[PDB]
Symmetry: D2
Subunit: 381 residues, 4 copies
Amino acid sequence: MKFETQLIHGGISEDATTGATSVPIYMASTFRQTKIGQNQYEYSRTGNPTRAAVEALIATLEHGSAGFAFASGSAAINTVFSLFSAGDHIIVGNDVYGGTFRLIDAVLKHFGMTFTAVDTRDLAAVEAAITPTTKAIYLETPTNPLLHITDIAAIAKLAQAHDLLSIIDNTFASPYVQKPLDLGVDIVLHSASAYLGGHSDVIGGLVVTKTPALGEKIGYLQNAIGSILAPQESWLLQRGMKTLALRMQAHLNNAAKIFTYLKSHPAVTKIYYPGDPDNPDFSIAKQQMNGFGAMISFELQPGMNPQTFVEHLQVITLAESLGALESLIEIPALMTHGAIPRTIRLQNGIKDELIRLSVGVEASDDLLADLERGFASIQAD
Amino acid sequence: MKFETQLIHGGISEDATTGATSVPIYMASTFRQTKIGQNQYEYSRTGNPTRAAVEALIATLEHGSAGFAFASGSAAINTVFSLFSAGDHIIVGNDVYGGTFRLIDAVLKHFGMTFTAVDTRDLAAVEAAITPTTKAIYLETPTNPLLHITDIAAIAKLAQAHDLLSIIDNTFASPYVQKPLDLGVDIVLHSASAYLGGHSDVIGGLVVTKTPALGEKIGYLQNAIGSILAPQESWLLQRGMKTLALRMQAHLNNAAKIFTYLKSHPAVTKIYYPGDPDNPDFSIAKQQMNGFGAMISFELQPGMNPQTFVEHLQVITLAESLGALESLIEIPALMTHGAIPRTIRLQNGIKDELIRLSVGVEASDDLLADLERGFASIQAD
Amino acid sequence: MKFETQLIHGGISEDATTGATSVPIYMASTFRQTKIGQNQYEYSRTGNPTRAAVEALIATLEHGSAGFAFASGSAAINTVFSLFSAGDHIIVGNDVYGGTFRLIDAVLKHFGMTFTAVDTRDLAAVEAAITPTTKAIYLETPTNPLLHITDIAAIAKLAQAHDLLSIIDNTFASPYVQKPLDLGVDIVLHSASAYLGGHSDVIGGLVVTKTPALGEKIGYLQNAIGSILAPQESWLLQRGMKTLALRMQAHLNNAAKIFTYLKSHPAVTKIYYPGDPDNPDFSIAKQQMNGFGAMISFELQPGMNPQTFVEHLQVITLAESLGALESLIEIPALMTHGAIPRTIRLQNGIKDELIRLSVGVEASDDLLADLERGFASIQAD
Amino acid sequence: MKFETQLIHGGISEDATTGATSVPIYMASTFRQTKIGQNQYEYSRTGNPTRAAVEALIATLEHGSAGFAFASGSAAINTVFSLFSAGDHIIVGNDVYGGTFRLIDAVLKHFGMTFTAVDTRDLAAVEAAITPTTKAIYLETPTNPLLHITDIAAIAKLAQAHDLLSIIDNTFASPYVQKPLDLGVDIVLHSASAYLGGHSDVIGGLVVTKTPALGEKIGYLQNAIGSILAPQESWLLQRGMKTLALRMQAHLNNAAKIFTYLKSHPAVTKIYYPGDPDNPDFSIAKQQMNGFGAMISFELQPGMNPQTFVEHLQVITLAESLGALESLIEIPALMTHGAIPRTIRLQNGIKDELIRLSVGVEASDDLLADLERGFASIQAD
Ligand SMILES: Cc1ncc(COP(=O)(O)O)c(/C=N/[C@@H](CO)C(=O)O)c1O
Ligand SMILES: Cc1ncc(COP(=O)(O)O)c(/C=N/[C@@H](CO)C(=O)O)c1O
Ligand SMILES: Cc1ncc(COP(=O)(O)O)c(/C=N/[C@@H](CO)C(=O)O)c1O
Ligand SMILES: Cc1ncc(COP(=O)(O)O)c(/C=N/[C@@H](CO)C(=O)O)c1O
């Protein structure tokens, strides 16, 4: 079936017993067994029909064999790194979500894991960073918040040639835009809190593995650590995923128009956007991404107050998060990336004045009218 | 106010703005800020009114400074142990939940943490286990499934004398029965999937710390690892907790009667129960526990089949989990503790014939009649 | 099985397919049919597993044939009265909930139904009100808010002798106190928003009938009018219902003490309470009720301001509704019964000075202490 | 703001106090009052923040003054008809949903209301039916299931000239397609179970009045009869509504392709579709509808078994209901319209073999392949 049909009917989308057109929400913590060990479900944390349903869906969408739903994107990441042990070495991208930087520095390094940050746009630099004790490569593409694009297929071949896990954080793209397991990657994960839920009303994470052997290891850690996605939220997450494609098209059309409009403003000095033809990422972006994503970051002229700008928007919402129906806007350095020290932020290209815009699905004319309220307030229209 | 009043009115139990006699379920993933950094709430994972309310309530019930709600009891444990680093040594009780055994051996030991199992009923053995790298003592009391009682106040003073964190799993008792923070312990935690929820319909974990400094450390890990309790399920947990005292009184009266009845039966060779006066635990049980719990384990004569016994009950339910309104029953070696290898199980007192019974709140007469069906099926009435 | 056991296991309390210890929440609106006319469920309004479970349970608890769940007690009453046609005449008790009065006067009378209000304590006056076009007798017992007791068995015999439907609103008592169908009544109904839900967090109605024929007519109207209880709230209602006996014991015990205490206060001139032995209803109360309920109304000395009294309570909550874990208090003339005109209020016994107290399950000591802050604020303790 | 922007941000879409980007779910049945009569909310049936939010939203979308949410479409209709009295006469269309027919015949006629069914496409017949006791005109447009289009503006002018209420069931269109209040109508109502919820997972109804005087009457009846939409489902409805415009566009695009495809199949003898240019309703549809709807009904050649056809579809689901993300199909005479007697069905144009297809948003190639499987099974490809 085609992708839009899989959103509506893929995974488990029905209750086989009743024919119900929605997967029932199994709040039950436990399950009566008639003879020990022959039940399909035993304990809600270990598995239950509602969570299994959204888990089957994301596996279908990402073209993986197994999916796993977690209480948050961060918990999904924490579980995946629980594959590694003291003395393992990991290669990480140098533009990541501030919370992933926090997990690495404040938790995983205490467990004896060691990390080297690399610009994964430079595959020479990636291969140079590989050591005999290296075990995996972890990167987001496009990145949070600079939207750097990494050649996934190239990273995956590099990874295969050295017996490394390749791990792609696919949050920003979504399986509608990018299916990294189709490019050789071992593990893909999402913060479902963004596009996959899409309604600004659910926190969760998703992991999909290509092979069943790696699925058995993730599933074992999922049950062992217990950072599971609750049944109500699993159900809400699936419901929102059903409109993923319809939402994404609106998202992407609106972003294309926002980019063009942002470039028509002299108040804007720099724009980060995978669809910029001047951007040297642009060719690998058009090859591996179905569209250019709905994130855009930009700087204003050095005299211009970003706080003043974002605080004078009226449709666009000043908030953390992204991928919601409503446009969200943020200053990474004061908000989602405050967890990264300022000196490190600035070495890796996150200026204190950078603005991150998650383009919603509102009417584009209303969005542009709103953005000009922001330019007007810094004398820049 | 008194405990029962606190269940209904404590923590946050009301919406201040409207007067709503229930805390609203905040499904929102994010919050509009009017200025950056002035919001009370910024991102659902970091905090939201709904999860905050149940966190406040368990903190009041346990007489602590701060509460923290997690996707499950296992996720609470995993977060607590992320306080520690590679090379840290931890003393654990030798009778723990099978999954806590699982997490320690399969995950925590890969992070460079080391562990020594000890009968925490023998305080000299505990002190003998303390090494220069030791960082904490972790134990359940009563234990799962043998219901061994440990002198909490003694363990705390031992831990304080050597700069250790004392961590008590209070799942089997609940704050109605046992308030470890009142006996000097540093951290108390729960699988909320038992008595606190009480209705067999929610998976969750709760952690309470005495001091605000330890609270800031748990809170930071909770946000950084992200195994939060979702909003809907936090609300459901708080709702169940409101009837904790009424449920607990009923649980406890049925368990008293179940204990008397199981001793009148010659088919039962051994009974594990804190209210047993033949138990050497009995004196400490009576001193630190308000009631003897509603868990009971027992063995049948070596001829008799426990699998047959449990499969012939019709009110008591054969399943995992405990602490629900419905009586639950289980064979640990085939179920909740099959994650511990057989050699270590029998070395530590868990025979394969052992039956664990979670005494519910049904009419006691309907419960004894049901147990008589199981005895009759192995010719032993 | 005994009542407490039925609460936990009666009606439908588990999912037969998986063994889930909770009935799953079927959010689906519709159900795939394989062959037309062969599905168990077709459309969620007509029926679904979640609502069916709570309907089955209340039917067990009330000793009836069929249960029906509505969006509120008002909607339940509206559907029951849709049994009747223009020209039909109904005898009603003269102390009914203000909203039942409003339905009758504002809606049902426009449908050509006619009504005589009668003190159903006086059976001779009930018989004198029976007319050639009379079809039914409808009353609450105990009444809202004067807690008048009517002889249920006698009213049924009277109704049977003239081919009338007898309808008892059982909200204040609950099946724990009073099972009207056991006394010959044709239809029993509840505002489940009170004791049955128990947690101040669900709006709902319930109807149970004795015979299947009357059940077919109520069910037909339920589906035709469509005032159904949604699945989420059906599941929440059933979960509340499981603790009904535990909660009721507590409610009843506190209300006993509250009554004793309110008689010791000279500021209280009059007390309405079915457990009052100076009450002429007391004997029939003791014969048809299992406990005297947990409502109490009372008046202060004419100088004393009831608004002052209730506004100075700190544990008792000033609000509408009743039957919650937490104590609620209210002034009917100003609140739940302001829908009745003041002249009709006074002729039927509801003074503007009247205070109605819904006794919760807080510790009785904290409740008596709270009540004396009320008395203190009008200089009367 | 534009329609697509109002979906995301109109009505009440935020929590004012916390800035939550989703309206909180107020499960509370009641609200503490500080001084009597000064609360914004007093009782959840009478109103609560969550239901108020979706009520504001639908009022904005339909360009009306006030919105009202009910437990189902049928309950919304039942409440609107409680505006009328015994002796009142109502004019109805002759093609209505089977349940509206049932409500009229089995309930409202018992209340002394009288009805005359009329082809509302024939304005002369409408005028001919107006009597001195007539008070309203009620019709769906498009109708269920023949999709008959009525000139709404003309019907409103007719009703204005005789001081009648015009009531339009707008379920099949959705406010994205059709806004009857902009054409002079007094009341618009929906079964929100269709396109508004959009996800096959909510039952509810909506009513919107143009004037505030009519709003006060509807609101008074809503509270008095109590057929409210519960808080959980109110919130789900609103979340579904947020994607209404994105879903509708996909709906309508698929329906145009399905219509073309069905017209090229000789097995199809008659098609009912508002966008058929040979349909005499085409011009009025083009003029008053923003698109032709996503419903299609059709008949096959007299030899061909419609049951065989629909039972061989694999993406299209045989089930009641409509307006869902997934395609639904149905045979009205055996299903949604079985409540109308067969003789009356055939008099008014519903043949026993009519098929009613609710076009979903699956990929159109997958839908066309699926329809082929149905035609193949009747030897008609
Ligand atoms: C690329 C990526 N991976 C993982 C996560 C973490 O996932 P949860 O938020 O725990 O669900 C995030 C979160 N980022 C949001 C929230 O701060 C934001 O930047 O605004 C992310 O952007
Ligand atoms: C003393 C203790 N601590 C932690 C946990 C782990 O808590 P979650 O299940 O993750 O909520 C449990 C679980 N025990 C149940 C579950 O199988 C059981 O044994 O039947 C426990 O008993
Ligand atoms: C004896 C009785 N029957 C029916 C109803 C109507 O029940 P819903 O509220 O529609 O569920 C009520 C409600 N009374 C509450 C609420 O005002 C109260 O008096 O405080 C009632 O007390
Ligand atoms: C034009 C119209 N108005 C009102 C209703 C009644 O609305 P609820 O179902 O009570 O929400 C319906 C329902 N019809 C659906 C379900 O049978 C169907 O035909 O498949 C309707 O189609």
